[PDB]
Design an enzyme around this catalytic site. Structure first.
Site, short mmCIF file in Angstrom:
data_model
loop_
_atom_site.label_atom_id
_atom_site.label_comp_id
_atom_site.label_asym_id
_atom_site.label_seq_id
_atom_site.Cartn_x
_atom_site.Cartn_y
_atom_site.Cartn_z
N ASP A 194 1.89 13.47 15.03
CA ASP A 194 1.91 13.37 13.57
C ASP A 194 0.49 13.40 13.03
OD1 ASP A 194 3.27 13.42 11.22
OD2 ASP A 194 3.56 11.22 11.09
N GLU B 41 7.32 -0.05 5.49
CA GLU B 41 6.50 -0.30 4.31
C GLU B 41 5.21 -0.95 4.79
OE1 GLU B 41 9.09 -2.62 1.75
OE2 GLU B 41 9.71 -0.82 0.65
N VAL B 42 4.08 -0.59 4.17
CA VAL B 42 2.77 -1.08 4.62
C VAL B 42 2.15 -1.94 3.53
CG1 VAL B 42 1.10 -0.29 6.30
CG2 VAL B 42 2.38 1.34 4.96
N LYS C 171 2.57 -3.69 8.75
CA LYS C 171 3.57 -2.64 8.63
C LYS C 171 4.92 -3.23 9.02
CE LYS C 171 4.40 1.37 11.42
NZ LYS C 171 4.01 2.76 11.77
N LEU D 84 0.81 -1.21 0.00
CA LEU D 84 0.00 0.00 0.00
C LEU D 84 0.84 1.27 0.00
CD1 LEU D 84 -2.67 -1.03 2.66
CD2 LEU D 84 -2.86 -1.21 0.16
N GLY D 85 2.05 1.21 0.54
CA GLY D 85 2.80 2.43 0.75
C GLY D 85 4.18 2.19 1.34
N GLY E 53 7.06 4.38 3.49
CA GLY E 53 7.42 5.58 4.21
C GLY E 53 8.90 5.65 4.50
N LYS E 54 9.26 6.63 5.32
CA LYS E 54 10.65 6.80 5.71
C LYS E 54 11.11 5.67 6.63
CE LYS E 54 10.61 10.61 4.44
NZ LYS E 54 10.51 11.90 5.17
N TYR E 55 10.21 5.12 7.43
CA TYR E 55 10.59 4.18 8.48
C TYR E 55 9.99 2.78 8.32
CZ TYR E 55 12.40 8.17 11.30
OH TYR E 55 13.10 9.26 11.75
C1 LIG Z 1 2.91 5.82 2.54
O1 LIG Z 1 3.67 4.82 3.17
C2 LIG Z 1 3.40 4.59 4.53
C3 LIG Z 1 4.33 3.93 5.32
C4 LIG Z 1 4.05 3.70 6.66
C5 LIG Z 1 2.83 4.12 7.20
N1 LIG Z 1 2.55 3.91 8.61
C6 LIG Z 1 1.53 3.38 9.12
N2 LIG Z 1 1.42 3.28 10.65
C7 LIG Z 1 0.00 2.54 11.04
O2 LIG Z 1 -0.38 2.31 12.14
C8 LIG Z 1 -0.77 2.21 9.71
C9 LIG Z 1 -1.93 1.60 9.79
C10 LIG Z 1 -2.98 1.34 8.71
C11 LIG Z 1 -2.86 1.81 7.41
C12 LIG Z 1 -3.86 1.53 6.49
C13 LIG Z 1 -4.97 0.78 6.87
O3 LIG Z 1 -5.99 0.49 5.95
C14 LIG Z 1 -5.68 0.77 4.61
C15 LIG Z 1 -5.07 0.31 8.18
O4 LIG Z 1 -6.18 -0.44 8.57
C16 LIG Z 1 -4.08 0.59 9.10
S1 LIG Z 1 0.15 2.73 8.44
C17 LIG Z 1 1.91 4.80 6.42
C18 LIG Z 1 2.20 5.03 5.08
#
Ligand SMILES: COc1ccc(/N=C2/NC(=O)/C(=C/c3ccc(OC)c(O)c3)S2)cc1
Length: 328
Positions: free
Chosen positions: A154, A50-51, A66, A43-44, A46-48
């Site tokens: 944040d 990957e999700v 995560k 999904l994504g 980040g700096k710290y």
């Molecule tokens: C864009 O790259 C990133 C990298 C790390 C990230 N850090 C999170 N730290 C949390 O707790 C997260 C929880 C979460 C995210 C999406 C969900 O549903 C789609 C969900 O249910 C829970 S993500 C966010 C974005």
């Protein structure tokens, strides 16, 4: 030197709880089985971390995994302890499990899944009522973590997951969150540029929960005025100039004078002199359906330079802005 500061609420929450509540360095992780979760898609990044979207095959349940990039074990146990201390709280993301990822050699956090629409599509269609509704739901989460001795640090649209079909909201990404201890000096390199409080931008380290209320004010201004982000700085210095062009320089100087703070002399050539503006000047035909006197007064009481003068989360939930929101 600088004048000390403490939060006006929840000041002593952590000193009255056992050391094990807040001494995250001593926390012992309880590990689940990494084989229970199959990664579906990224999904994504980040700096710290990957999700990933994933599935718990011992559950058939959709989850979010995560996977942490390497960072000092202090901050990993900080986020884990905070998520466990807050689990079950109103609109707090639920940490379901923790595993060792075999590839990364680092922990992987397993969260409940939220079927969210990205905010850049959602904020285009949120109504006046929706904004009030979701702002109240965010306030529930913040008052909860504040009452539990924790500041999020944040708050931003990306960290607010909304399943708009079920009207479900979750505050996510507790990786910058920290325990509040009166008198403690904190790192000012937190929050995203557009949501940093004036305390961060003037390098005042003895800040507290009120930082989150500034960030929330910034989100609110972007939503009701349809300008995302609202204070659109090009860097951290220009960020404070953008704020000063709205809140005025006289109250900025009152603020730093109260705390015996000095501005970075590089502001000499850039800050200028600005009167405080009436919020009505940001109203136009394309956002006027999102704006009311109550909206502007509420925003005005969040976006204060003086972190000690901002509404608390609790006080904010009392504001007439929310009188129209059905309370369950
Ligand atoms: C864009 O790259 C990133 C990298 C790390 C990230 N850090 C999170 N730290 C949390 O707790 C997260 C929880 C979460 C995210 C999406 C969900 O549903 C789609 C969900 O249910 C829970 S993500 C966010 C974005």
């Amino acid at each position: 030197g600088p004048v000390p500061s403490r939060a006006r609420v929840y000041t002593d929450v952590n000193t009255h709880r056992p050391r094990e509540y807040w001494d995250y360095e001593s926390h012992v992780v309880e590990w689940g089985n990494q084989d229970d979760y199959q990664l579906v898609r990224k999904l994504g990044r980040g700096k710290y971390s990957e999700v990933f979207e994933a599935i718990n095959i011992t559950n058939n349940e959709k989850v979010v995994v995560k996977i942490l990039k390497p960072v000092k074990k202090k901050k990993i146990k900080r986020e884990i302890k905070i998520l466990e201390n807050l689990r079950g709280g109103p609109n707090i993301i639920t940490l379901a499990d923790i595993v060792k990822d075999p590839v990364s050699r680092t922990p992987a956090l397993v969260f409940e899944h939220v079927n969210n629409t990205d905010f850049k599509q959602l904020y285009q269609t949120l109504t006046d009522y929706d904004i009030r509704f979701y702002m109240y739901e965010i306030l529930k989460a913040l008052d909860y973590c504040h009452s539990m001795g924790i500041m999020h640090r944040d708050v931003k649209p990306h960290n607010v997951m909304i399943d708009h079909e079920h009207r479900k909201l979750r505050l996510i990404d507790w990786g910058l969150a920290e325990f509040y201890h009166p008198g403690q000096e904190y790192n000012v390199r937190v929050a995203s540029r557009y949501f940093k409080g004036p305390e961060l931008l003037v390098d005042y380290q003895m800040y507290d929960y009120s930082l989150d209320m500034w960030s929330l004010g910034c989100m609110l201004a972007s939503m009701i005025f349809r300008k995302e982000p609202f204070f659109h700085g090009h860097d951290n210095y220009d960020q404070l100039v953008r704020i000063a062009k709205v809140l005025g320089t006289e109250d900025l100087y009152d603020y730093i004078d109260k705390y015996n703070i000095e501005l970075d002399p590089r502001f000499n050539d850039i800050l200028g002199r600005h009167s405080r503006k009436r919020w009505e000047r940001f109203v136009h035909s394309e956002n006027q359906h999102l704006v009311s006197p109550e909206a502007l007064d509420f925003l005005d009481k969040l976006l204060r330079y003086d972190h000690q003068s901002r509404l608390t989360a609790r006080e904010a939930m009392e504001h007439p802005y929310f009188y129209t929101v059905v309370k369950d």
